[PDB]
């Protein structure tokens, strides 16, 4: 229980979140995504995904500096006759490859999608529109979206949701950064990547879909540098 919100667990690097506001930092439920047979994966950025969550987003945009750990709870239930496996990875500094011949050309509005996040692709497509480039991420699942083999992503803090065994995953991420505190609007400290390690299947049904829900609670929150409100440009 954290605040008025209530409900194996993995503590990233064995380090519980710690201090170097209090009401605002509680469990928030993002929009549900649909796991299909042909799904490739999903990603979110923290604190970006929580930027429109009650008082936590207000504190994000009213302060120059902020820091927080997180507790991420992935929820996905199915029957005993379903099969499939998900890998949930927490990546510090989760930089994703772009889609253009120009290096680092992804624009701010696409790098910070919010609680909807983005999806991995099965292959790499190069954006050719030069007059109006998309300037979006093109994260390939087997390259883990950053030019590394997804099979080695298990070096990151992670959990596995095997449908025959468990239906939930819990990751406790401490604040990780080269600084004690940073700008929450400039920098995403954590990334969450969910990849289907084993494809979803249900007997004699090429139609089954099951929901995945993420609930994220910021922890050990600190804010500093109160000023007027930041209003980032949107697309």
């Amino acid at each position: 229980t954290l605040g008025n919100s209530t409900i194996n667990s993995v503590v990233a690097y064995g380090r519980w979140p710690e201090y170097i506001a209090v009401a605002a930092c509680r469990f928030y439920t993002l929009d549900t995504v649909t796991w299909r047979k042909e799904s490739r994966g999903w990603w979110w950025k923290l604190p970006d995904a929580l930027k429109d969550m009650g008082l936590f987003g207000q504190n994000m945009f009213y302060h120059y500096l902020g820091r927080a750990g997180y507790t991420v709870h992935v929820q996905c239930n199915a029957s005993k006759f379903h099969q499939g496996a998900l890998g949930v990875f927490a990546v510090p500094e989760m930089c994703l490859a772009g889609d253009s011949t120009t290096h680092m050309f992804t624009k701010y509005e696409n790098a910070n999608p919010g609680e909807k996040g983005g999806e991995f692709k099965g292959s790499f497509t190069l954006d050719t529109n030069a007059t109006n480039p998309a300037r979006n991420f093109c994260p390939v699942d087997y390259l883990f979206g950053s030019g590394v083999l997804a099979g080695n992503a298990f070096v990151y803090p992670h959990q596995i949701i095997n449908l025959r065994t468990n239906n939930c995953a819990t990751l406790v991420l401490p604040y990780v950064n080269s600084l004690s505190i940073d700008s929450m609007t400039k920098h995403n400290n954590w990334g969450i990547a969910i990849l289907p390690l084993a494809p979803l299947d249900f007997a004699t049904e090429s139609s089954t879909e099951i929901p995945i829900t993420l609930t994220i609670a910021p922890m050990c929150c600190e804010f500093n540098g109160l000023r007027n409100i930041t209003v980032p440009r949107t697309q």
């Binding site: 439920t29 549900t32 005993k80 379903h82 099951i210 995945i212 829900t213």
Partner: protein, 55 residues
């Protein structure tokens, strides 16, 4: 009684995920609700009820 100044709030139920069943299983089911008071509950000013009347 129903009074705005002493309103209590709202109780709501939602699907966090959906309900999933295998084959050869009922797809519709029922839930039941029960309510009670906790040990810190108290009442005041005994009065007649509106739930019984005589004709």
């Amino acid at each position: 009684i129903n009074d705005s100044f002493t309103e209590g709030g709202y109780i709501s139920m939602f699907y966090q995920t959906r309900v999933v069943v295998p084959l050869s299983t009922p797809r519709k089911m029922d839930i039941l609700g029960f309510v009670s008071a906790c040990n810190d509950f108290s009442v005041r000013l005994l009065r007649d009820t509106t739930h019984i009347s005589q004709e």
